[PDB]
C-alpha cells in the first residue's frame, strides 16, 4: 500500500493555542501509522501541510533537523509548551461542582483531565478517592464511600438518584 | 483493504436517546462493510468521527478498549441506558388517547412501547386485554371485548367505525 502525504486533508496554521496543536499532531501521527508510509520518506514531503503563516518558519529552520522525531519535537517546542504535572494538579481542585450540572458531564470532564499524567502512576482506587471530594451536597448525603467498587457503579447510583427528582 | 473514515458524512455529537445512536451505529456498520476496511485496522481511525463532547469522552476512556466489539459495546452502554421494568408500566398508563387521533397511530405507539420488556413474559391475549381501558368513548360503544382476538381485527373494526363517521 504505497502512498505519501499528498492526499491528506489535515492542515495547521499559525494559531498559538494548545488543543489545536495537540489534535493536529495526533491526527498526523495516526495517519502516518495507518497508511504505512515509510519512516523516512515522510520527512521529504512534510512541507505540503502548512499554511502561509508557518511556511516561512519552516523555511527558516529546515537544517536543524535530521529525522522525524526531532521535527515533531521541534514543532511542539516552538508553538506550544507541554504541560508539566503540577499545573494539572492545580487545575483539578479549583472549580468545585456547581449546583445544576448532571453527574455524567462532571465525571466525563474530570476523567478527560486525568489521562494526561504519566501512565501507571495511579490505579483505579486512588483515582476514585481523589474524585470523590468535590461532589455537590445533593449526592454526598445518600451514597457513601463504603460501596463504590470503581466508576461504573457511581454513575449508576447517580442516575437512579437523579431520576427521582432529587 | 485499507482506508480511513475521513470520507463519511456521519457524526455523533452525544444526545441521550435511542433512535440517533441506533441509526448512527447502523450507518457506521454499513460503511465499514461496504468499503472493505478490516477490524483491527479500523479501530485506530475511529477518532475522526466524534466531535464536541463525544471527543472529550473518547479521550477519557481509551485503554479499556482493544477490538471493534468492545468499542461498540462501550458506546451503546454509556449513551443509551436500558430502562428497568417498572418505568415502562408507569409510562404506559399515563396517556389516554385524545378525541382527535386515528386508531393506527395510537395502537402503533402503544405497541412500540411494550417490546422493551424481557422476551416471553406476555401472551397476545393478555396484552390485548391490557390495551383496552384506554380507548376513547367513540370506539368503545360499538366493538365488544368478546368479539375480537388478534390485533388484525381491532384495526378492521376501527376503520369501519371511522369511515361511517
Amino acid at each position: 500500500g504505497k502512498g505519501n502525504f499528498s492526499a491528506c486533508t489535515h492542515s495547521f496554521g499559525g494559531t498559538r493555542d494548545h488543543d489545536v496543536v495537540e489534535e493536529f499532531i495526533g491526527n498526523i501521527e495516526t495517519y502516518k501509522d495507518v497508511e504505512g508510509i515509510s519512516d523516512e520518506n515522510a520527512l521529504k514531503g512534510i512541507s505540503l501541510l502548512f499554511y502561509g503563516m508557518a511556511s516561512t518558519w519552516w523555511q527558516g529552520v529546515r537544517k536543524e533537523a535530521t529525522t522525524w522525531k526531532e521535527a515533531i519535537a521541534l514543532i511542539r517546542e516552538h508553538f506550544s509548551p507541554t504541560k508539566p504535572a503540577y499545573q494539572i494538579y492545580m487545575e483539578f481542585f479549583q472549580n468545585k461542582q456547581d449546583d445544576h450540572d448532571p453527574i455524567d458531564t462532571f465525571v466525563i470532564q474530570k476523567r478527560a483531565l486525568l489521562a494526561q499524567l504519566p501512565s501507571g502512576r495511579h490505579d483505579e482506587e486512588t483515582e476514585l478517592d481523589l474524585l470523590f471530594g468535590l461532589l455537590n451536597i445533593k449526592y454526598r448525603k445518600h451514597i457513601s464511600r463504603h460501596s463504590v467498587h470503581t466508576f461504573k457503579d457511581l454513575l449508576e447510583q447517580g442516575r437512579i438518584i437523579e431520576h427521582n427528582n432529587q | 483493504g485499507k482506508g480511513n473514515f475521513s470520507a463519511c458524512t456521519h457524526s455523533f455529537g452525544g444526545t441521550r436517546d435511542h433512535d440517533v445512536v441506533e441509526e448512527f451505529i447502523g450507518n457506521i456498520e454499513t460503511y465499514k462493510d461496504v468499503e472493505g476496511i478490516s477490524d483491527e485496522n479500523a479501530l485506530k481511525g475511529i477518532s475522526l468521527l466524534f466531535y464536541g463532547m463525544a471527543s472529550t469522552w473518547w479521550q477519557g476512556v481509551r485503554k479499556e478498549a482493544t477490538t471493534w466489539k468492545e468499542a461498540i459495546a462501550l458506546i451503546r452502554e454509556h449513551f443509551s441506558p436500558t430502562k428497568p421494568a417498572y418505568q415502562i408500566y408507569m409510562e404506559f398508563f399515563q396517556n389516554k388517547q385524545d378525541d382527535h387521533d386515528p386508531i393506527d397511530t395510537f395502537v402503533i405507539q402503544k405497541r412500540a412501547l411494550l417490546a422493551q420488556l424481557p422476551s416471553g413474559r406476555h401472551d397476545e391475549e393478555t396484552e390485548l386485554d391490557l390495551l383496552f381501558g384506554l380507548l376513547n368513548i367513540k370506539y368503545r360503544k360499538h366493538i365488544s371485548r368478546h368479539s375480537v382476538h388478534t390485533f388484525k381485527d381491532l384495526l378492521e373494526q376501527g376503520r369501519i367505525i371511522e369511515h361511517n363517521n
Binding site: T9, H10, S11 | C8, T9, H10, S11, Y51
Partner: peptide, 27 residues
Amino acid sequence: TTRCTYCSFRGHTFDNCRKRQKDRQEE
C-alpha cells in the same frame, strides 16, 4: 430532513461541515 445547507448532505448542521470549517475554505 435538515439537509446540510452548504454541502447539501443529510448528515449534519450548518455550524460544523468539513469543507467550510477546514480544507482551507472561508477565504
